[PDB]
Each structure stands twice: as C-alpha cells, then as structure tokens.
C-alpha cells in the first residue's frame, strides 16, 4: 500500500501456490529395434572388398538396447551423444559391416592417414558416422588364419565418396595387442535428406501418487497430483480432455490403468487486521485453500479454522453473533476485541423482532421526531486533454 | 498464471511491459465489490429481523407456498425451490481462473426475503418508514383500494370472492412456472453469457498467434533464448490482447448489470414498501402491492393488480341544473341510461342518488 | 450402380477420450449420402480394375471366405517404384513394400466351386516378380472374423485407407447386421487398425481376388468411395465411442446444426 | 545508441506500447464518464423532485417521510440535506373494521 | 471483407488469431437486436389497433 500506516480492514496480498514436490518420468519400455543389433553384434560380417552398405529406415533407432553393451571403450559422437538419442528421430541410417585388420579401425575414421585405407573403404569428406572400436577377435578368428578378407583392391583411378594392409597371413588370435582383427561398426546417418521415418527410444522411472509432482508421460510434461481414477478409457485412447479441450486423465503406458490429473492447490492470500496504532496482530487468509498444506511456507499456526472460502490462520474463532466488521466470506466476519486479539464469528444479520400480530390491535404513534440526513453525489470530474504527439 | 504461468521467462518478460496486471487486478476487484454491494442494497434494506407468527389467519388469504416451510433444510419458498430446480447449467481452475463465493449465502437472502414479506403482511407499509406497526390485512387492502381511488366497502362486500380469485391466480402462476421454463430466459442468458465468455477465453490459449506453436514449454525446449523470445513475446502479445478484450466486455456487462440492479432496488423500495402511482411500473394494471422472491443472482416480483373486466355504458352530462344553478360532482361522474340520472365513482359502476352533499354549486346554467 | 451411402465411412480420427463431448473435426471424410461406385465381382468377365487412389479410399464389402484377399497400392505397380502388397489371410498379413514386378493376374486364385468343384489352389501369382525389395512386414498371427461363415451377413469389412505425409493408416470395423440386401442404414465407427510410417505415395490401387466363360456370374458386391475434405460434428458418447455424426456441407439443416 | 535502421524496431515497440496504453486510458476515461453522467442525471432528477417539490416516492429523498431538502455545492459534486418526518413513540389500541 | 477481403491466404493466416471477429459479430448482432427491442418496447405498448 506504499504507506507506513494502514487502515483497519482486509487487503489482498501476494497469491500462494503449492510448489512441486518432485519429478516423475513414466514411459513405455524398449520398443521395436532398428537393424542395429546385427550391425554391432553378429557372427559374421561382410567382406572387406564387399564392404556392406545397409539402408535402415522405418524402425526405431533404440540407443538403449545398443548402449547397454559394456564392451565399448569410448563410444561418443563428436556432435551428439547416445544418451540424448531418446528424443532424436532419424531419416535413414547406413550400416557399414566389414572385417579388416585391427590397426585399420582408425583408418576407417574420417580424416585419417594412409594409402591403404581408401583402397578398400574410401574416406568421404562429410562422414558423420561415429567411429566405434570394439573387440571382435574371437568372431573374426580362425584356427589357421583367414586370408579370404584380403585387400587386393589396388585400383589406380581416384576413388569418389562412397562410389560402391596384408601384413598378417590370416586373422588369428595369436595377433598381438592392437593387431587382432576388429569389426569396424559405424552408424553413418544423415538428417534433412530423407523423410523422417526413424525415431528414438524412451526411459521411465518409478510411480508416485498424491503429490504435486512434475509428471512426464509419453512426452506429455506437466505438473500435478496423480490419483487412481475409475474412468474407463478405450483400449487405444491413452488420455482424455475436458470440455475445455484440456488433458484431465492419462493412462499409464507401462501398466494398463487410468489416472487423474489434479493441479496442486493454490489461491490468493490476504491479511486482516485493525488499525496500525490499534494493534500489531494480524490474520492471514488463503482463499480457496485448505489448512492441509498451509505449513508449506507462520508455518506453525496454532490457531486454524476451516471455512468454505478457505482456511484461516492466526485468528480465534467465536461462536457468537455480531454485525459484520471485516467481511471474510460465506457469512463469516472478523472483529478485534479482548488480552486484545483478533476474532472471527458468524455475522449477525440483525436483532430478531416479532410483531405482536393480532389483526385487532393498532399501534398509533403518540409523537414524532424530525430528522436531517446528508446525501452526497458526484456531478462531474476535472476535464482533461492531451497532445498525442 | 493464465498467460504464461510457471516460467521465470514469463515473469521477467511480463515485467518488461509494466503494470497491466496491476491495473486489471483492481479492474476486476471493483466489479466483485460492486456485485457484493448491489446485493447489499437490493436485499439488506431492513434494520431488524422479523418472523411470521404461527397463526396464519390472514382473512382467508393463503400465504403459504411463498412462505417458508420449516421442514425443508433450506427455508425457501415452494416457488423459490421450484425456480432453483428449473435453473440449471468447474474445470476452468487450471489457469488461475478463480470464482469468489458471494459474501452472503442463499440462506441469508432467504431469511431477508422472509423478514421482508412478514413485515409487509404484518404492518402494511409502516415498517419501511420505521418501526413496524401491526395492522389487519383487511384494513391494509381497504387502504390500497383507497389508494387506487376505490371505496373500501366493496372490499368487504366481496372479501371471499377476492380471496378466492387471489388463491386461483397464485395457484395458476405456480402451475405456469412449473410447466414452462422460458420465463427464466433472462437469468439463463446471463449465466450462459458468463460461461461462454470464460470458455472462449480459455480457448484462446491454444492459438499460436503467428508463433510456431502455442505450447510455451515446447518453445522453451526446442529453442534458445533469442528465438524463444521472438516467439514468446508474440504469444504474450496475443494472450494479452485476448485478456483485455475479456476484461472490457466484463466491464460493460457489469455496468449494465449495475443499472439493472439500481432499477430493481427502486422497484423494491417503491412497489413493495409502498403503493406507488407510476403507470405500469409495478406491472400492468392498477398496482396494489408486490411480493419478492430470491433466485440465483436474480429476483422475482409478483405484481398484484386490479383490472376492470365487464362494462355497461350509459349517457352522460357535463353537469346538472336544478334551480338555474350549475351543480357538479365532487368526485366520480354523472351517468344516465335514460330513465334516471345518478353519480358514481369513476372506476366502478356504483350508481347513487344525486343530492346536495354529493355535488357542489358553481355559477349559473347558461355559461 | 451409382449407389448412395447413408451414414458409413466414419472412423475414429484420434486417440482422444472424450466423454459426452460433441466435437467438430475438419478432415478427409466420405460425404453423407455421397454417390459411391458399386462393383459386382464377376467370376471371362472379371471386375478387377485398377482404380485411382484419390487421396483416401473407402472400401466396403460383406463378402465371406476372404474372396478378396488383399490390396495392391502404388504409383507405378511395375517395380519401378516400391509398391505395397497387403495380401492377407486368417493368421496374419505379409505386408510387403517393395519394388515388385506385378503380373496381369497377381493373386493366388483359388477358383473353387467354379470349374468342377473338388478342391485346389490354382496359381501362386501372389509372387509375380521383383526388381528389388525395400521392406516387408508380417503382422501378428491374428484370427479375424473374415473367413467363410455366412449365416446372416455380419462381416461388414469397411476399410478406410489414408496416406498422409508418408504415414499410411488403415481403419476398419466388423459391423454385424441382418439385412442381406444392399448396405442397410446404421451408424458404426471404424476404429484404426494399422498405422505404417511407410513414406511412399499411392496414385493407383488394385484389388486382389481369390477366362471362366460359361461359369455362373459371381455373387459378391463391394463399394468404392472417395473421401473429401469436409467438416463433421461427431458425438462422443459418455464412453468416448462415436454414436452420431453430422456434415455441414450436406444441406442447410446440417450446416446450421454444426454451426 | 542505435543506427536509425535497427532503432526503428525499438521505436515501433515503444510507439505501440504508448499508444495502446493511451487508448486503454481513453476507454477507462469514457466508461468513468458514462457512469458519472448516469449519476449526474439521477442527481438532477433528485434535485428537481425533492428541492423544487415534495415527492411521494418511498425513501427517494432520504429515509422517512420527505418534507423538503436543500442543496450544497461540493467540489465536482453536490450535497443534499433531506428533512424528514418520522414517528417516535407508539401506543396501540383496539380497532374494528 | 474488411480484414482479409477476398484472400484465401489472408484468411488462413487470420485463422491463427482465434475468433475475435466472431465475438465482434455476436456483439453487433446483439446491438441490432437491441435496437429492434427498444423500438418494440417504446412503441408497441398497445395490442389493439
Ligand atoms: C395454501 O395452499 C397450500 C397448498 O399446498 C396449502 O398447503 C396444503 O398442501 C397440500 C398439498 O401438499 C394440500 O393437500 C394436502 O395434501 C396432503 C398430502 O398430499 C397428498 O396426500 C394426501 C393423503 O395423505 C391427499 O389427501 C392429498 O390430496 C394429496 O394427494 C394431505 O395430507 C392433506 O390432507 C391435503 O389434502 C392442502 O389442501 C393444502 N392445505 C390448504 C389449507 O390449502 C396451505 O395450507 C394453504 N394455506 C392456507 C392458510 O390455507
Ligand atoms: C339503467 O336502467 C335500469 C333500469 O332498472 C336502472 O335501474 C335502476 O334501479 C333502481 C332501483 O333498483 C331505480 O330506482 C327505482 O327503481 C324502482 C324499480 O326499479 C326499476 O323499475 C322502475 C320501474 O318500475 C324504474 O323506474 C327504475 O328506474 C328501475 O328500472 C322504481 O319503481 C323507482 O321509481 C325508481 O326508479 C333506478 O331509477 C334505476 N335507474 C334508471 C336510470 O333507470 C339503472 O340505474 C340504469 N343504469 C344507469 C347508469 O343509469
Ligand atoms: C520395461 O521394464 C521392465 C523390463 O523387464 C518390464 O516391466 C515389468 O516387468 C515385470 C516382470 O517381468 C512384468 O510383470 C509381469 O507382467 C505380465 C503382464 O501380462 C504378467 O502377466 C506377469 O504375471 C508379470 O506380472 C511386467 O510386464 C512389467 N510391468 C511394467 C509396469 O513395466 C517391462 O519389460 C517388458 O517385458 C515384456 C513383458 C514386454 O512387456 C516387453 O514389451 C517389455 O520389454 C517393461 N515395462 C512395460 C512395457 O511396461
Ligand atoms: C461405456 O459404458 C457404457 C455403460 O457404462 C456401455 O454401455 C453399456 O451400458 C450398461 C449400463 O451401464 C452396462 O451395464 C450392462 O452390461 C451388460 C453386459 O456386461 C449388458 O448385458 C447390460 O445390458 C448393460 O449394458 C454395460 O456394461 C455397458 N456395456 C455393455 C457391452 O453392455 C458402453 O458400451 C461403454 N462404451 C464402450 C465399451 O465402448
Ligand atoms: C481440508 O482437508 C481435510 C482432510 O485433509 C478435509 O477433511 C476430510 O478428510 C478426509 C480424509 O479421509 C477426506 O476423506 C474428506 O474428503 C475430507 N473432506 C473434504 C471436504 O475435503 C477438510 O474437509 C478439508 N477442508 C476444506 C476443503 O475446506
Ligand atoms: C354503448 O355505446 C354504443 C355506441 O353506439 C351504443 O350503441 C352500440 O354501438 C356499437 C357500435 O358503435 C354497436 O356495436 C352496438 O351494437 C350498439 N348497441 C346499441 C344498443 O345501440 C350502445 O347503445 C351504448 N349502450 C348504452 C348507453 O347502454
Ligand atoms: C496365413 O498367412 C500367413 C502369412 O502371413 C501364412 O504363413 C505361411 O507360413 C509358412 C511357414 O512360415 C510359409 O512357408 C508360407 O509361405 C506362409 N504362407 C503364405 C505366405 O501364403 C499362413 O500359412 C496362412 N494360413 C492360412 C490358413 O492361410
Ligand atoms: C398492544 O396492546 C397489547 C395489550 O395486551 C400489548 O401487546 C404487547 O406488545 C408487545 C410488543 O412490543 C409485546 O412485547 C407484549 O408481549 C405484548 N403484551 C400483550 C399482553 O399482548 C401492548 O399493550 C401493546 N403492544 C405494544 C405497545 O407494542
Ligand atoms: C489511530 O489514529 C490516531 C493516531 O495513531 C490515534 O490517536 C487513534 O487512537 C487511532 N484511531 C482511533 C479511531 O482511535
Ligand atoms: C461454540 O459452541 C459450539 C457448541 O457448544 C461448539 O461446538 C463450538 O466449539 C463453540 N465455538 C467457540 C469459538 O466457542
Ligand atoms: C448419385 O445418386 C443420386 C441420386 O440418384 C444422383 O442425384 C446423383 O446424380 C448420382 N451421382 C452421379 C450420377 O454422379
Ligand atoms: C462342373 O461339373 C458339374 C456337372 O454337373 C456342373 O454342375 C458345373 O457346371 C461344373 N462346375 C462346378 C461344379 O463348379
Ligand atoms: C535392388 O537392387 C538394385 C541393384 O541391383 C538397386 O538399384 C535397387 O535400389 C535395389 N532396391 C530397390 C527398391 O530397387
């Protein structure tokens, strides 16, 4: 009120809102998988000269089922990360599957050195395929040594970007550290090139109820209280909307059930007090709020009373009748009295009277009293004009 | 909350603009206070509280259906409960939309109207001027007959018939309001207007207003501060304009509502607390009294009126000559269907012998 | 026969659960009483034409024993562009989006009770020839009421085929009735049956059946209709099942109703 | 601080804000004028009917029976002194029709 | 005819702005109905020629 003294009465103040209690994430589980399990784990790969090129689309690039593997030493992308692949949708993914010398794993990486690398796998200048190094010595190993995976490709003509060494007798487990055969697996994917048809996986957490929590269900993020609901969703309808076309009910993705959404309590707050010099004892009211949550943010209370218009704190209830002094709502009114304290009560609409009706007696006045009363009415206010410019 | 709740970006960007919310707070608060006040004037016009006596010996006039019945938990009239049932229609809270209950309670309004009707029937029109003074209802009706310039004698001469006609009329209005519902169209329309305004206000939340989307959370997640702002300011702009529009037509509707409330208060204080003379103000026909009944957010008046029904015309003369002097009626009018001449009150066919006391002299005949 | 529908062609558009809510939706809809093409599958005479897939196809039929096994969808239908094979039977579909090279009569062709009625499978032109493939899907080994059990015709296999921004959707519903005459009047929503993010475009669609001169004319009727962009007022019952619908563009009465 | 070309954006922003605020003020002013004028009409009616004459309307010229009233100019407003009759003490008897 | 007079593109654009002109049309329709109602109330106070 921008004043050091305030008149007796009720005055609106800053509202109140129940802040969230915690966050909850509920989602379905690992869904269909893109043909990646085969590319990063298989019994046999394609030949080095016949380096595999598999187009992948119309599936889910589920990085969860792929990253659950612990055999990887360093699996991170220079521009992205697998962890944040839950909410990334791919257009098409190219899978390159071939068996080469172990020392040639990095030579498959872009920006490498060596004329023996482009002989069997040319290095394009705009390769976004993240490099992956993993052990495949057992898979690529043969007892006598497999020489079939030769690098005889020695074409003299320059190799264009994706237009289509032999220091070991064969792929043998006896090869030393860094020399054992390695299966180079790269998820070479491009965006903005083909229509979006591949989307990522999701993650879930535990469930809670009867708490102001930030719930995320199937990408629907919102804060509220989750309570079991008896509403019967259809087998395919996962949520419902009110006449206001606003989500009100949500079906759990993991378990099959229906839950409500109830935004946690909030409402205005106001103060009731006598004049400043009158006293320094105040009453706080929470319109449309319950004392169930008033200890959230005077949290002790010690004098609380429920009311249809909210729950009052710091005031004393009275079961007597008096004329309304400071209205509260629902026929409730406050006054300051005796020691002195603020009190609330049911307003006294007026002193009861009952005329002695007999339709046979008549009350005729004996005399009168002339009275003078004031009436005040505005008739005008000060004029006004302005230069727009 | 309504515009961009739950966002520090919302808070700071709204702070950029200024004090529009600040003003609109009082804008709506004055409206709420005005509603409460209007209720105060229209209903709480009595210093004390009165209660009907147990003996309902109102000269055979039946007061009951309007009167309270102790049996029901809500001490409303039969008719008032019927109206409550007739009138008919809370998911909008989600965006800070809050409804403040009326300071009073339907129960309080019911008690007020009960006391009003009791005082009226018991003390005529005196309670308004001051302390209620007991009177016989028959005496009050005689005074009303005088007020419409009707001789009291007829009232008693047809007390029973008048009572029966009143009973039939009250029953007929009961049945009519019970059957049809179109009478409550005004209140139904008011409620529907309010509901539709709020509903549309909610609907506006879904508009992008030229933004990429109408989900501030999606904008925040997808975009970084600069273009997130580029979209958010636009959304704020659109929602802002929608809100001022709403506040405006709320202002205008409240203004006209206040005018109607003042009219209703005047009607109360004039038709009910007394017998006025403004033609058609207290309903069609010659006004006698009225009886209020509370309704959700509204009031109902039962205007009681006299109406002539049958006619029997005659031949008249401006005045009469007896001894070369002009005699004129003090009140009423002369009348003759031939055979004889008489004088009678204008508003009822009550022929009477013309004599000295009936008339008065003025001048001679020729003029 | 240029028949006219009455109330069919209404499919659930979304997954929204609306209880006793009257919701308006502007989308591809088969107009009420829209004139629709009638086809009698003649078992020399063969009613197997390649018809345009004018952005949304409504198929309807009461046939039994899965006489019409599946659909062919494509813009070339000659292995130049990947085409969709939807041949289906009791257990599951063999959905095949592949640059397949089709034949003149690319279907299994079980001509029973036709030549002299003992039993056999005539041909296997279901797999005519293929330039490549690009993808194939096999659905769950379901068992739908599409086999041969006539009784009173209750297998109303209405199907809504849509291909919007690459996503191809199929709505369907088994509606039981008793009148064996032409499509009886009634209301029955068509729930979504299968969604597919295929990403291809269909300009022409052909039926798949299951010189037969002298043999009696075939006894099997099916209707083809084409949806168009229209606004429909849909009545969601208490339990979120559409029970009634109105179309503004039908007549002034429906227009005022929806407004 | 800003070259005219880009400064035009901020200038337009401020222009829009100031003009919209001004028109909001105008709307509030004119509605205030509407109700004040209604009150003024009521006041003129009361002046004519209570000062220049003795009205029969119930409680129109103040509580109790109206005898006559006096005006008093007030800053941008007016005051009326309603003189009224009111019975004081009552003693009852037995009546007959 | 005023905001986007005879323009499919401009109509499509204004669609993003809710139904403001719809509410305005409702309002002015009420105004005209009120005009007629005022005429009726103030003049046809009698039902017998
Ligand atoms: C003013 O009008 C009021 C009319 O409601 C009077 O209150 C009384 O209301 C009842 C109707 O509820 C009238 O009829 C009575 O009905 C009750 C029960 O209703 C039904 O059941 C009984 C059998 O138990 C049957 O006889 C009735 O006809 C109904 O079918 C009966 O128990 C009563 O005996 C009576 O029939 C009353 O006539 C009505 N009383 C009067 C005097 O009109 C109210 O009393 C009236 N006030 C005055 C001062 O007269
Ligand atoms: C319209 O004509 C009516 C005819 O009766 C008028 O009736 C009035 O009735 C009173 C008596 O009830 C008359 O006063 C006396 O009436 C008795 C008998 O009453 C009737 O019969 C006589 C003839 O036997 C006739 O002269 C009367 O007028 C009545 O018609 C007479 O024996 C007495 O002499 C004396 O008349 C009234 O005179 C009579 N009024 C008139 C004008 O006749 C009724 O009043 C008429 N209505 C009006 C407005 O004038
Ligand atoms: C994701 O998280 C785990 C991964 O294993 C699974 O969640 C729960 O695992 C429970 C134990 O396996 C399952 O309980 C069983 O449920 C079936 C349902 O018919 C009952 O018949 C049986 O008696 C058990 O009670 C439960 O299925 C599952 N519940 C929840 C809320 O998750 C689950 O893995 C899944 O495994 C199988 C069963 C399929 O559902 C797969 O799609 C999925 O990977 C996942 N949770 C899901 C899908 O909600
Ligand atoms: C959504 O719920 C309603 C009912 O709540 C379904 O309509 C049917 O209405 C009755 C009355 O509630 C339900 O009770 C009885 O069910 C038995 C069968 O269990 C039936 O023989 C009775 O005649 C009566 O209907 C009934 O459960 C309920 N459904 C059925 C199949 O009867 C309405 O079908 C529901 N919407 C759906 C399933 O889409
Ligand atoms: C405020 O909260 C209490 C409970 O926290 C309400 O009292 C009842 O508590 C029981 C607990 O089982 C519930 O079953 C009832 O539903 C509660 N009643 C209501 C109306 O919520 C108390 O009534 C609440 N006061 C309010 C909302 O004014
Ligand atoms: C009442 O006034 C009418 C007016 O002349 C008198 O005559 C009637 O005239 C109207 C048409 O103006 C006709 O409808 C009636 O049939 C006429 N009735 C008679 C008896 O003439 C009528 O006589 C007057 N009645 C009186 C003075 O008692
Ligand atoms: C129903 O459809 C499925 C195919 O969707 C049929 O699957 C057959 O299964 C065997 C073994 O896997 C394959 O060799 C066949 O090629 C499949 N038959 C085909 C493609 O026509 C299944 O047999 C069918 N069942 C019936 C009763 O028709
Ligand atoms: C009216 O005359 C009767 C004579 O008995 C009295 O009635 C009293 O009225 C008052 C109401 O103010 C009641 O409190 C008393 O209980 C009544 N007593 C009786 C016996 O009726 C009284 O003399 C007169 N009433 C007045 C002046 O109010
Ligand atoms: C508060 O106002 C003045 C100054 O504080 C003080 O004298 C007075 O006692 C208080 N008000 C009333 C009505 O007593
Ligand atoms: C008032 O009296 C009632 C009944 O004895 C009791 O329940 C209530 O607690 C009392 N309230 C106060 C403030 O004394
Ligand atoms: C479809 O049937 C109706 C009714 O006979 C007819 O008016 C309409 O012309 C038909 N549609 C055609 C011929 O395209
Ligand atoms: C085959 O033989 C029988 C011989 O009567 C004949 O009815 C029919 O026309 C032929 N075709 C069948 C049985 O499908
Ligand atoms: C099938 O193989 C050919 C090359 O032999 C290739 O051009 C074509 O893209 C492949 N797939 C499709 C769908 O045509």
- Give Cβ neighbours of residue B36 (< 8 Å, ≥ 6 apart): B102, B103, B104
DSSP, collapsed to helix, strand or coil, labels residue D35 as helix
Task: Tell the residue nearest (CA) to atom 5 of ligand 9.
Answer: A277
| CA–CA distance, A193 with A195 (Å, rounded to integer) | 7
User: What count of other Cβ atoms lies within 10 Å of the Cβ of residue C73?
Assistant: 25
Measured between its terminal Cα atoms, the distance across chain C in Å is 34
**Measured distance CA(B99)–CA(A172) in Å, rounded:** 81
Q: Compute the C-alpha angle A207/A213/A219, nearest 5°.
A: 75
Characterize the bridge pairing of strands D77-85 and D65-74: antiparallel
- Measured in angstroms, the CA of B71 and the nearest CA of chain A are apart by 21
Distance CA D93, CA D71 (A): 41
| Tokens linked to B132 | 């209620």
How is residue A158 annotated by DSSP?
A: P
Candidate of C75, C132, C136, C198 to mutate for ligand 13, largest count of ligand atoms within 8 Å of Cβ: C132
Ranges assigned E (strand) in A151-219: 182-190, 213-217
Pairing of strands A316-322, A341-347: parallel
Q: Round to whole Å and give the CA distance between A297 and D82.
A: 54
Cα A169 to Cα A186: distance, rounded to the nearest angstrom = 26
**B210–chain E nearest CA distance, Å:** 6
Q: List, in order, residues 6 or more apart from A253 with CB less than 8 Å away.
A: A26, A27, A28, A204, A217, A218, A238
Give A99's strand partners.
A183
Asked if residue C67 lies in contact with residue C220, where contact means CB atoms within 8 angstroms, the answer is: yes
How many beta-carbon pairs below 8 A join chains A and C? Answer: 45
Residues of A in contact with B57 (CB under 8 A): 359
Q: Does the beta-carbon distance from C15 to A238 stay under 8 Å?
A: yes
Structure tokens at E12: 């499509």
Listed by number, the residues of chain C in 106-135 with a beta carbon closer than 8 Å to a beta carbon of chain A are 134-135
Q: Please report, for residues A140, B144, B236, C22, the alpha-carbon distance to residue E22 in angstroms, rounded to integers and kept in the order given.
A: 73, 53, 21, 20
Q: HSE (CB half, 13 Å, CA atoms) of C259? A: 10
Residue with the nearest Cα to atom 2 of ligand 12?
C116
Those residues of chain A whose CB sits closer than 8 Å to some CB in chain D are: 360-382, 384, 386, 388
Q: Give the closest residue to C97 by CA, choosing from C128, C130, C67.
A: C130
User: Which residues share a beta bridge with C236?
Assistant: C21, C242
What are the C-alpha distances in Å from C54 to residues A153, C51, C75, C164, C222?
A: 51, 9, 11, 12, 18
Element of type H or E holding C85: strand C83-85
> How far is ligand 5, taken at its centre, from the CA of residue C8, in Å?
50
Q: What does each C-alpha distance from A123 to A79, A107, A187, B99, C78 come to in angstroms?
A: 19, 9, 15, 69, 37
Residues of chain D contacting residue B252, judged by C-beta atoms under 8 Å apart: 31
End-to-end CA distance of chain B: 86
Which tokens go with C187? 């209301």
Which of the residues D47, D51, D77 would you substitute to probe the A interface, choosing the one with the greatest number of A C-beta atoms within 10 Å?
D77
B172: β partners: none
Phi, psi of A280 (to 5 degrees): -125, 35
On whether the CB atoms of residues A307 and A331 are closer than 8 A, the answer is no
d(CA B241, CA D19): 14
- Bridge partner residues of B342 (DSSP): B335
Choose among B138, B136, B116, B137: nearest CA to B127: B116
Mutate to test the interface with B, among E10, E12, E17 (most CBs of B within 10 A): E17
Residue from the list B17, B130, B255 with its beta carbon closest to the beta carbon of D87: B130
Q: Which atom of ligand 13 is the closest one to the Cα of C79?
A: 14
SS3 C129: strand
Candidate from A288, A331, A356 with C-beta closest to B98? A288
Residue A290 CA to ligand 5 centre (angstroms): 8
* Closest CB to E16 among B200, B209, B249: B209
Q: Name the residue with the closest Cα to ligand 9, atom 3.
A: A277
* Bridge partners, residue C244, by sequence: C235
CA distance C29 to B212: 28
Inter-chain residue contact C16 with A197, CB threshold 8 Å: no
E24 token code pair: 């305005």
Contacts within 8 Å (CB) and 24+ apart, A188-193: A188/A93, A188/A94, A188/A95, A188/A96, A188/A127, A188/A128, A188/A129, A189/A61, A189/A90, A189/A91, A189/A92, A189/A93, A189/A94, A189/A128, A189/A129, A190/A91, A190/A92, A190/A94, A190/A128, A191/A90, A191/A91, A192/A91, A193/A91, A193/A92
Q: Which of C122, B103, D72 is nearest to A324 (CA)?
A: B103
Looking at ligand 12, which atom is closest to the CA of residue C114?
14
Number of H helices, E strands in chain A: 3, 21
Q: Which of D86, D96, D97 to mutate to test the interface with A (most CBs of A within 10 A)?
A: D86
A210 Cβ inside 6 Å of ligand 5: no
Nearest CA to ligand 3 atom 5: A29
Quoted resolution (Å): 4.2
* Ligand 1, atom nearest to B60 Cα: 49
C173: helix, coil or strand?
strand
Give B189-196's long-range contacts (Cβ < 8 A, gap of 24+). Answer: B190/B257, B190/B297, B190/B298, B191/B87, B191/B89, B191/B297, B193/B253, B195/B89
Reported residue count of chain D is 97
Touching, B vs D (3+ Cβ pairs under 8 A):
yes
> Directed axis angle between helix B225-267 and helix E20-43, to 10°?
10
Concatenated DSSP letters of A255-287: S--EEEEEPPPEEEEEEEE--TTT-S--EEEEE
The angle, 0 to 180 degrees and rounded to 10, between the axes of the packed helices B225-267 and B8-17 is 70
């Amino acid at each position: 009120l921008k004043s050091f003294t305030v008149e007796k009465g009720i005055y609106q103040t800053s509202n109140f809102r129940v802040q969230p209690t915690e966050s909850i994430v509920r989602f379905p589980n690992i869904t269909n998988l893109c043909p990646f399990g085969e590319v990063f784990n298989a019994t046999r790969f394609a030949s080095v000269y016949a380096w595999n090129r598999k187009r992948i689309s119309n599936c889910v690039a589920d990085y969860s089922v792929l990253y659950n593997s612990a055999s990887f030493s360093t699996f991170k992308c220079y521009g992205v990360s697998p962890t944040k692949l839950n909410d990334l949708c791919f257009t098409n993914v190219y899978a390159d599957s071939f068996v080469i010398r172990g020392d040639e794993v990095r030579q498959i990486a872009p920006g490498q050195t060596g004329k023996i690398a482009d002989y069997n796998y040319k290095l394009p200048d705009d390769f976004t395929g993240c490099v992956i190094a993993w052990n495949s010595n057992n898979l690529d190993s043969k007892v006598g040594g497999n020489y079939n995976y030769l690098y005889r490709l020695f074409r003299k003509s320059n190799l264009k970007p994706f237009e289509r060494p032999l220091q070991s007798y064969g792929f043998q487990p006896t090869n030393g550290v860094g020399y054992q055969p390695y299966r180079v697996v790269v998820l070479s994917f491009e965006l903005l090139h083909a229509p979006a048809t591949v989307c990522g996986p999701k993650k879930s957490t535990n469930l809670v109820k009867n708490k102001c929590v930030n719930f995320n269900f199937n990408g629907l993020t919102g804060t509220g209280v989750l309570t079991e609901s008896n509403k019967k969703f259809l087998p395919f309808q996962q949520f419902g909307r009110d006449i206001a076309d606003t989500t009100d009910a949500v079906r759990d993705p993991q378990t099959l059930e229906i839950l409500d959404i109830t935004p946690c309590s909030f409402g205005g707050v106001s103060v009731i007090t006598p004049g400043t010099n009158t006293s320094n004892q105040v009453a706080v009211l929470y319109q449309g709020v319950n004392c169930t949550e008033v200890p959230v943010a005077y949290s002790t209370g010690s004098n609380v009373f429920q009311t249809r218009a909210g729950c009052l704190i710091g005031a004393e209830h009275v079961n007597n009748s008096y004329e309304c002094d400071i209205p509260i709502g629902a026929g409730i009114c406050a006054s300051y009295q005796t020691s002195q304290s603020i009190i609330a009560y049911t307003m006294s609409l007026g002193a009861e009277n009952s005329v002695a009706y007999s339709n046979n007696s008549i009350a005729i006045p004996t005399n009168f009293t002339i009275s003078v009363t004031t009436e005040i009415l505005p008739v005008s206010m000060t004029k006004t004009s302005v230069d727009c410019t | 909350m309504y515009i961009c709740g739950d966002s520090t970006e919302c808070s700071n960007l709204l702070l950029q603009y200024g004090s529009f919310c600040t003003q609109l707070n009082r804008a709506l608060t004055g409206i709420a206070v005005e509603q409460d006040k209007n209720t105060q004037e229209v209903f709480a016009q009595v210093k004390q509280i009165y209660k009907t006596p147990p003996i309902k010996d109102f000269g055979g006039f039946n007061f009951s259906q309007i009167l309270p019945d102790p049996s029901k938990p809500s001490k409303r009239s039969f008719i008032e409960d019927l109206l409550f049932n007739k009138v008919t229609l809370c998911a909008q809270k989600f965006n800070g939309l809050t409804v403040l209950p009326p300071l009073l309670t339907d129960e309080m309004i019911a008690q007020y109207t009960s006391a009003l009707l009791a005082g009226t029937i018991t003390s005529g029109w005196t309670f308004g001027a001051g302390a209620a003074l007991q009177i016989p209802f028959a005496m009050q009706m005689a005074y009303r007959f005088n007020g419409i310039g009707v001789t009291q004698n007829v009232l008693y001469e047809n007390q029973k018939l008048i009572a029966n006609q009143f009973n039939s009329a009250i029953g007929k209005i009961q049945d009519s309001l019970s059957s049809t519902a179109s009478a409550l169209g005004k209140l139904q329309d008011v409620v529907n207007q309010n509901a539709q305004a709020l509903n549309t206000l909610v609907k506006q939340l879904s508009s992008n207003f030229g933004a990429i989307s109408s989900v501030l959370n999606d904008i925040l997640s997808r975009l970084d501060p600069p273009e997130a702002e580029v979209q958010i300011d636009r959304l704020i702009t659109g929602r802002l304009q929608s809100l001022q529009t709403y506040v405006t037509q709320q202002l205008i509707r409240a203004a006209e509502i206040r005018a109607s409330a003042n009219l209703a208060a005047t009607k109360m204080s004039e038709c009910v607390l007394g017998q006025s003379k403004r033609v058609d103000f207290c309903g069609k026909g010659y006004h006698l009294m009225s009886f209020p009944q509370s309704a959700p957010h509204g009031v109902v008046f039962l205007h009681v009126t006299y109406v002539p029904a049958q006619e029997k015309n005659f031949t008249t003369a401006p005045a009469i000559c007896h001894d070369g002097k002009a005699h004129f009626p003090r009140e009423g009018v002369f009348v003759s269907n031939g055979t004889h001449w008489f004088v009678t009150q204008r508003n009822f066919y009550e022929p009477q012998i013309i004599t000295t006391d009936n008339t008065f002299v003025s001048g001679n005949c020729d003029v | 026969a240029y028949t006219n529908s009455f109330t069919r062609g209404v499919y659930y558009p979304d997954k929204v659960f609306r209880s006793s809510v009257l919701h308006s939706t502007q989308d591809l809809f088969l107009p009420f009483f829209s004139n629709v093409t009638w086809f009698h599958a003649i078992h020399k005479r063969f009613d197997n034409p390649v018809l345009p897939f004018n952005d949304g196809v409504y198929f309807a039929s009461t046939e039994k024993s899965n006489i019409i096994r599946g659909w062919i969808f494509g813009t070339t239908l000659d292995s130049k562009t990947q085409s969709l094979l939807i041949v289906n039977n009791a257990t599951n579909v063999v959905i095949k989006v592949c640059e397949f090279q089709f034949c003149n009569d690319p279907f299994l062709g079980v001509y029973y009770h036709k030549n002299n009625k003992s039993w056999m499978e005539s041909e296997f032109r279901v797999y005519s020839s293929a330039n490549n493939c690009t993808f194939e899907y096999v659905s769950q080994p379901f068992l739908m009421d599409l086999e041969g059990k006539q009784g009173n015709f209750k297998n109303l296999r209405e199907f809504v085929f849509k291909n919007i921004d690459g996503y191809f959707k199929i709505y369907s519903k088994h509606t039981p009735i008793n009148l064996v005459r032409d499509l009886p009047q009634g209301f029955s929503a068509l729930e979504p049956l299968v969604d597919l993010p295929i990403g291809i475009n269909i300009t022409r669609f052909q039926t798949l059946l299951a010189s037969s001169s002298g043999w009696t004319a075939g006894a099997a009727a099916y209707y083809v209709g084409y949806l168009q962009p229209r606004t429909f007022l849909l009545k969601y019952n208490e339990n979120g099942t559409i029970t009634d619908a109105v179309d503004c563009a039908l007549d002034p009465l429906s227009e005022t109703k929806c407004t």
